[PDB]
Amino acid sequence: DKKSARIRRATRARRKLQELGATRLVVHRTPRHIYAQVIAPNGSEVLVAASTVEKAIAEQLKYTGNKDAAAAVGKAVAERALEKGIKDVSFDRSGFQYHGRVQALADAAREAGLQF
Amino acid sequence: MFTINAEVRKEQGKGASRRLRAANKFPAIIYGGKEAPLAIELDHDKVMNMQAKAEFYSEVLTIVVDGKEIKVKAQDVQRHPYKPKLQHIDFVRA
Amino acid sequence: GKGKGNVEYWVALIQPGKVLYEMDGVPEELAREAFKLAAAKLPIKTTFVTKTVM
Amino acid sequence: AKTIKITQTRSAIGRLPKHKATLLGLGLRRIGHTVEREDTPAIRGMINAVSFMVKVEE
Amino acid sequence: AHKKAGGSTRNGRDSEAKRLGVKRFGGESVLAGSIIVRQRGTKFHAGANVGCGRDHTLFAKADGKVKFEVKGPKNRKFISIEAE
RNA sequence: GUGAAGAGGGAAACAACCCAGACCGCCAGCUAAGGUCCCAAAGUCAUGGUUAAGUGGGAAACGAUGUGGGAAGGCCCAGAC
RNA sequence: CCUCCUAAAGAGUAACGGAGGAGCACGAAGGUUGGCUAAUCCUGGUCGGACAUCAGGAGGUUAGUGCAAUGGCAUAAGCCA
RNA sequence: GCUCAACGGAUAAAAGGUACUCCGGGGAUAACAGGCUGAUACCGCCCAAGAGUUCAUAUCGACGGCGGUGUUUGGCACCUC
RNA sequence: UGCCUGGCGGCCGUAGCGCGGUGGUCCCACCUGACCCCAUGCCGAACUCAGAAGUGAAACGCCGUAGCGCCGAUGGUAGUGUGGGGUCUCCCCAUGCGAGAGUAGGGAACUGCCAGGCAU
Ligand SMILES: [Mg+2]
Ligand SMILES: [Mg+2]
Ligand SMILES: [Mg+2]
Ligand SMILES: [Mg+2]
Ligand SMILES: [Mg+2]
Ligand SMILES: [Mg+2]
Ligand SMILES: [Mg+2]
Ligand SMILES: [Mg+2]
Ligand SMILES: [Mg+2]
Ligand SMILES: [Mg+2]
Ligand SMILES: [Mg+2]
Ligand SMILES: [Mg+2]
Ligand SMILES: [Mg+2]
Ligand SMILES: [Mg+2]
Ligand SMILES: [Mg+2]
Ligand SMILES: [Mg+2]
Ligand SMILES: [Mg+2]
Ligand SMILES: [Mg+2]
Ligand SMILES: [Mg+2]
Ligand SMILES: [Mg+2]
Ligand SMILES: [Mg+2]
Ligand SMILES: [Mg+2]
Ligand SMILES: [Mg+2]
Ligand SMILES: [Mg+2]
């Protein structure tokens, strides 16, 4: 399955981060929405979460599944992390090729202030 | 159709069981049912003679312990490896 | 010395209770006679056992 | 607080070194030596270990 | 039939034992860099603060106390160092 | 574990087996192993069985109406063997 | 010199004990990043079959690991770039 | 830069005979005898296919099995070099 | 608060498989099309991008099912540490530890954080 292959791809970097203890900015890209979360190193506590599924972000977007929606959601998640003082995270692409919407989200977060 | 007079075991374990089997009795268990299992102390010679019938392992035995009758089935039998003796009998409450 | 020996025959270690030979389709007395004849050729004490449900 | 008395009734010759060390821990020194100790689970364990060669007057 | 016969053997070879196995057992307190287990292949895996060398030797990377646990979906055995 | 490098008592004799670790003396007592008829210290001790083979006091498959105990079973005063 | 067993569930442990290998290879067969997952069998299919390539399924790592055996390996240590 | 591979590597550089022998030692280690053991050897016995005109057991006795002796060939290396 | 969905875990088969059913407002998936960014040792299959017509078909989620997988007592048995004993290449007794298999039985997971949807 596609998602099984994606999980298999992601697991290595996820375990490396999980043992390193880095706060994790995990992305999740779908054909329509792109989700971003920042999660504690233990993995069982969601620090912040910004997604196109929610009205506050979506209402400023034409289509929720493209590079511009990704840039908007990355900007939002980075600003909320900076308001929670998260400051320094590490990027978990979750198997998605770091390119296109995922890369645009990453650059939006980097310019907003998240360090990775 | 067969009635088996049984008495309650006082001590369990390898030593007590081998003491029984030397003293011409043998341990048995009554499990199954909705209550805790009961360990009993059967009379080896009578039980061997009565199990000689092939319907012992088919009809519902009755066990008389402390006057209380228990209707059981013969579930499993452990036999001596090279003797016509019994070592243990599993009864199921029924 | 000078190494181990060469394989000469094959055995099957027998412990008490092991049911060596089994037989079916014959009368019981003839089975007893046949088993007596067979046991006379073996170096281990034996006995005659029957089938039971359990 | 309760005290038991332990009397060595057999030799320590040919015993396992662990048995000899248990005898020493109990403080017993020779056959017919009686010592007084406290009644603790540890002491009971020592006595159980060397129960074949000591007698206990509880 | 007088004296004897004769006959060489083809075996009689072996290698120096490598002294593998668990060096520091569970509950022990190690210094940083202490070898916890020498092994062939990750029979034991590297948990928290435990590093795996090239020969799959597990060494504690932080001071503390050893801790074995069955972890993961494959019920593998992980050595971790509780912070002490 | 013992002997080696440990004597003493027992196993007849018998380093290595069982009991037990000799500082010296005593014409004192209690014991371990092992024993108590005589050699040879100590029960011709008490109770209930077994063996009739000198078994005890060397040895197997196998054989046998030896004898003792046990749980059954078969045929029987229309009187059975 | 390496691997398994003997080796008595820590380490170690002998024999003219039972089995096998080494006296190298690689500039990539190393590093990293990204990606991928095997054997076998069945079905269908030009030459072309028991075994060539193609497609589907069952299967589940019974594969692979430059070379022995063991321990590992799916996050792959296996296969490409 | 050593197949110094007898791989902790005596020299850079080394094979044999002695019944013509000699010395120091050993029963630490062989041949002879003794000893322990009894694979082998020898002698018994158990089951009994079959042979024996029929009939296993007059006489043999297969396929197997269990012992005895210390009578050969041995094993070990305890006494004696 | 209730229920559904998505993500990250906890845990690692009482949690997996099979079989039957069910879901599309939201989510997810399939889907539509490739100047493009990006791509196939050929192929927009996969990866990627721009989208949203349609369908939950497959997948996934959930529900129900014991046919398996899985877990699993009590009892007994095997083994075994220490001390004894026997006709001792194997056993037995006192005491301590006590399985494996099997039996009754359980069993179609449970659970935390965040977000969205619906009914509030
Ligand atoms: Mg016992
Ligand atoms: Mg060797
Ligand atoms: Mg000397
Ligand atoms: Mg002496
Ligand atoms: Mg000494
Ligand atoms: Mg003496
Ligand atoms: Mg004698
Ligand atoms: Mg004397
Ligand atoms: Mg002294
Ligand atoms: Mg006296
Ligand atoms: Mg006298
Ligand atoms: Mg070992
Ligand atoms: Mg050991
Ligand atoms: Mg390689
Ligand atoms: Mg590599
Ligand atoms: Mg040399
Ligand atoms: Mg050398
Ligand atoms: Mg000379
Ligand atoms: Mg000699
Ligand atoms: Mg000689
Ligand atoms: Mg001789
Ligand atoms: Mg002599
Ligand atoms: Mg002499
Ligand atoms: Mg069990």
Swiss-Prot record, chain A:
Q: Which family does it belong to?
A: Belongs to the universal ribosomal protein uL18 family.
Renumbered to this chain, region (Required for binding of the 5S rRNA/L5/L18 complex to the 23S rRNA) spans 1-16
In its UniProt entry, the species of origin is given as Escherichia coli (strain K12)
- The source's superkingdom equals Bacteria
Q: The organism's lineage?
A: Bacteria, Pseudomonadati, Pseudomonadota, Gammaproteobacteria, Enterobacterales
Please name the Gene3D superfamilies in this protein's record: 3.30.420.100
> What are the GO BP annotations of this UniProt entry?
cytoplasmic translation
One GO cellular component term of this record is:
cytosol
InterPro entries, alphabetized: Ribosomal_uL18_bac-type, Ribosomal_uL18_bac/euk
Q: What keywords are assigned to this protein?
A: Phosphoprotein, Ribonucleoprotein, Ribosomal protein, RNA-binding, rRNA-binding
Q: What is the role of the protein in this entry?
A: This is one of the proteins that mediates the attachment of the 5S rRNA subcomplex onto the large ribosomal subunit where it forms part of the central protuberance. Binds stably to 5S rRNA; increases binding abilities of L5 in a cooperative fashion; both proteins together confer 23S rRNA binding. The 5S rRNA and some of its associated proteins might help stabilize positioning of ribosome-bound tRNAs.
- Give the protein's recorded name: Large ribosomal subunit protein uL18
Q: Does the keyword RNA-binding apply?
A: yes
Q: What is known of its domains?
A: The basic N-terminus is not necessary for binding to 5S rRNA. It is however required for cooperative binding of L5 and L18 to 5S rRNA as well as for binding of the 5S rRNA/L5/L18 complex to the 23S rRNA.
Pfam families in alphabetical order: Ribosomal_L18p
Q: Quaternary structure?
A: Part of the 50S ribosomal subunit; part of the 5S rRNA/L5/L18/L25 subcomplex. Contacts the 5S and 23S rRNAs.
Asked if the Swiss-Prot or TrEMBL record annotates the protein with the keyword Ribosomal protein, the reply is: yes
Q: Which PANTHER family match?
A: 39S RIBOSOMAL PROTEIN L18, MITOCHONDRIAL, LARGE RIBOSOMAL SUBUNIT PROTEIN UL18M
Gene Ontology molecular function: any one: structural constituent of ribosome
From Swiss-Prot, chain B:
Any one cellular component term from GO for this entry? cytosol
One GO molecular function term of this record is: structural constituent of ribosome
- What protein name is recorded for this chain? Large ribosomal subunit protein bL25
Keywords assigned by UniProt?
Ribonucleoprotein, Ribosomal protein, RNA-binding, rRNA-binding
Q: InterPro entries, per this entry? A: Rbsml_bL25/Gln-tRNA_synth_N (IPR020056), Ribosomal_bL25/Gln-tRNA_synth (IPR011035), Ribosomal_bL25_short (IPR020055), Ribosomal_L25_dom (IPR029751), Ribosomal_uL5_bac-type (IPR020930)
Q: Which gene encodes it?
A: rplY
Q: Which family does it belong to?
A: Belongs to the bacterial ribosomal protein bL25 family.
List, in alphabetical order, the GO biological process terms annotated in this UniProt record.
cytoplasmic translation; negative regulation of translation; response to radiation; ribosomal large subunit assembly; translation
Swiss-Prot record, chain D:
- List the record's Gene Ontology CC terms alphabetically: cytoplasm; cytosolic large ribosomal subunit
Single GO molecular function: structural constituent of ribosome
Q: Which InterPro entries match?
A: Ribo_uL30_ferredoxin-like_sf, Ribosomal_uL30_bac-type, Ribosomal_uL30_CS, Ribosomal_uL30_ferredoxin-like
One Pfam family from the record: Ribosomal_L30
Note the SS bond partners.
none
Q: Keywords of this protein's UniProt record, alphabetized?
A: Ribonucleoprotein, Ribosomal protein
Q: Which PANTHER family match?
A: LARGE RIBOSOMAL SUBUNIT PROTEIN UL30M, MITOCHONDRIAL RIBOSOMAL PROTEIN L30
Q: Which family does it belong to?
A: Belongs to the universal ribosomal protein uL30 family.
In Swiss-Prot or TrEMBL terms, this protein is called: Large ribosomal subunit protein uL30
Q: Which organism is it from?
A: Escherichia coli (strain K12)
Curated annotation (Swiss-Prot), chain E:
The entry's keywords: Ribonucleoprotein, Ribosomal protein, RNA-binding, rRNA-binding, tRNA-binding
**Which terms under GO biological process does the entry name?**
assembly of large subunit precursor of preribosome; cytoplasmic translation; cytosolic ribosome assembly; positive regulation of ribosome biogenesis; regulation of cell growth; ribosomal large subunit assembly
**One Gene Ontology term, aspect cellular component:** cytosolic large ribosomal subunit
Q: SUPFAM superfamilies this protein is in?
A: Ribosomal L27 protein-like
For the region Disordered, what residue ranges are annotated? 1-19
MF terms (GO), sorted A to Z: ribosome binding; rRNA binding; structural constituent of ribosome; tRNA binding
Assembly notes: Part of the 50S ribosomal subunit. Cross-links to the 23S rRNA. Cross-links to the A and P site tRNAs.
Q: Which NCBIfam families match?
A: L27 (TIGR00062)
Against HAMAP family, the record matches this protein to:
Ribosomal_bL27
Which family is this protein grouped under?
Answer: Belongs to the bacterial ribosomal protein bL27 family.
This chain belongs to which protein, by name? Large ribosomal subunit protein bL27
Q: Origin organism of this chain?
A: Escherichia coli (strain K12)
